[PDB]
């Protein structure tokens, strides 16, 4: 099979340089094809940035010429993207892809935020239902972190159905995110449900068990 | 640079009905080699874009014959013969005939279903947040349709839109519904000075959910 995996810093300061790696598996980048970079801005806009061919020739989007460089390391079967002196407008999801030469297969994409704001760990709060059916809805609230993304799962991911995780929203340099999970009443509290949150940026991993509320007055 | 434009911006199609998206270029995509390099792309919620169509009509390996591409010059069309739920997401047209290669802005395909009121859940601040000196009240509106919904927060009867953060999911292909979270954040001191906390959902007679501090 042929799989592409992007990797790199999720947060870079303005005026600094951006650096991304695409690791290719299942095919040698020296054999054939063009190896592309493409980004998607917030709002869904897609932009082709450029490619490096199997033969090592490069082609760049004229809009980016004096900023961009695409290189490769044939010993690690990797190709790279570099933008010098980024600005906040370079904030986007970056994708590696390959085609012959037009892109035909895409990577998983990696988010890069360009900002001056400071990396901040999340507070995670359990949301237990009010004392007042056949199903019950629990929640998790994650506040005051930066930058995106956080990884939120229920029971380390074993809980999948009936989960709704709401897109993070930025306010005053800090993100808020929430998630709800609906299960049958024969499931909880008879069985423990825990919200798990991972924030790679701050090396944070925290767990929060949802405990039933006590009786109301 | 070659401008790609799509219409409509959003298409609401009933399951089983055909859907057609339009794409236009600011100049002819017919190359001097005879071929026309017009491509279609699909991006399902939370996923990377996938190739759907190349050379106007050719299907990428794995794509059902339900999908038909056509057109020429500067006018192209993507047709989905029997729309299924998993087809929902964003469709992009893009050109490879001219340099640099450029993409259309996208068209969202949403599944049309019967209207549905939200299931509303309210959550007082957690003991953990309260102890830290903050207070967030959370309202979940789950599994509603259409997407356009309004939430009013009332504290001791008084409406309050200050310090409210709202967030919608994309459409769920399981039941073709949407969900949204509304979070009202106050200081603990403000929170402890009022009694009733109520969120009301009205939808494109409110569904109301409420609790009283002095009952917790």
């Amino acid at each position: 099979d042929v799989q592409l995996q992007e990797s790199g810093p999720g947060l870079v300061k303005p005026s600094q340089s951006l650096s991304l790696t695409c690791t290719v598996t299942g095919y040698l980048i020296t054999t054939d094809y063009a190896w592309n970079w493409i980004r998607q801005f917030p709002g869904n806009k897609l932009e082709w940035m450029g490619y490096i061919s199997y033969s090592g020739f490069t082609s760049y989007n004229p809009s980016l010429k004096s900023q961009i460089s695409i290189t490769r390391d044939t010993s690690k079967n990797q190709f790279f993207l570099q933008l010098n002196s980024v600005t906040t407008e370079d904030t986007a999801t970056y994708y590696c892809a390959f085609g012959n030469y037009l892109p035909a297969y895409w990577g998983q994409g990696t988010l890069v935020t360009v900002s001056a704001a400071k990396t901040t760990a999340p507070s995670v709060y359990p949301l237990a239902p009010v004392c007042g059916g056949s199903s019950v809805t629990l929640g998790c609230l994650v506040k005051g972190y930066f930058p995106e993304p956080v990884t939120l799962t229920w029971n380390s991911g074993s809980l999948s159905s009936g989960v709704h995780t709401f897109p993070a929203v930025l306010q005053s340099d800090l993100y808020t995110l929430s998630s709800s999970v609906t299960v049958t009443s024969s499931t909880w509290p008879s069985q423990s449900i825990t919200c798990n949150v991972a924030h790679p940026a701050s090396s944070t991993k925290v767990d929060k068990k949802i405990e039933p509320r006590g009786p109301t007055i | 640079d070659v401008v790609m434009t799509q219409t409509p911006l959003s298409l609401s199609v009933t399951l089983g009905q055909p859907a057609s998206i339009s794409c236009k270029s600011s100049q002819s995509l017919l190359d001097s080699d005879g071929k026309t390099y017009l491509n279609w792309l699909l991006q399902r919620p939370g996923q990377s874009p996938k190739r759907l169509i190349y050379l106007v009509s050719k299907l990428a390996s794995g794509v059902p014959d339900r999908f038909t591409g056509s057109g020429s010059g500067t006018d192209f069309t993507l047709k989905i013969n029997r729309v299924e739920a998993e087809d929902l997401g964003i469709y992009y047209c893009w050109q490879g005939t001219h340099f640099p290669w450029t993409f259309g802005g996208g068209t969202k395909l949403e599944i049309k279903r019967a209207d549905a009121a939200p299931t509303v859940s309210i959550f007082p601040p957690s003991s953990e947040q309260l102890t830290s000196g903050g207070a967030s009240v959370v309202c979940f509106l789950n599994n509603f349709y259409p997407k356009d919904i309004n939430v009013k927060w009332k504290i001791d009867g008084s409406e309050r839109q200050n310090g409210v953060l709202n967030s919608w999911t994309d459409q769920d292909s399981k039941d073709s519904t949407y969900s949204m979270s509304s979070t009202l954040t106050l200081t603990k001191d403000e929170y402890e000075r009022h009694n009733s906390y109520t969120c009301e959902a009205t939808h494109k007679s409110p569904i109301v959910k409420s609790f009283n501090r002095n009952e917790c």
Partner: peptide
Amino acid sequence: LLELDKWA
């Protein structure tokens, strides 16, 4: 096995 386009 991708077929070639004009750029290849």
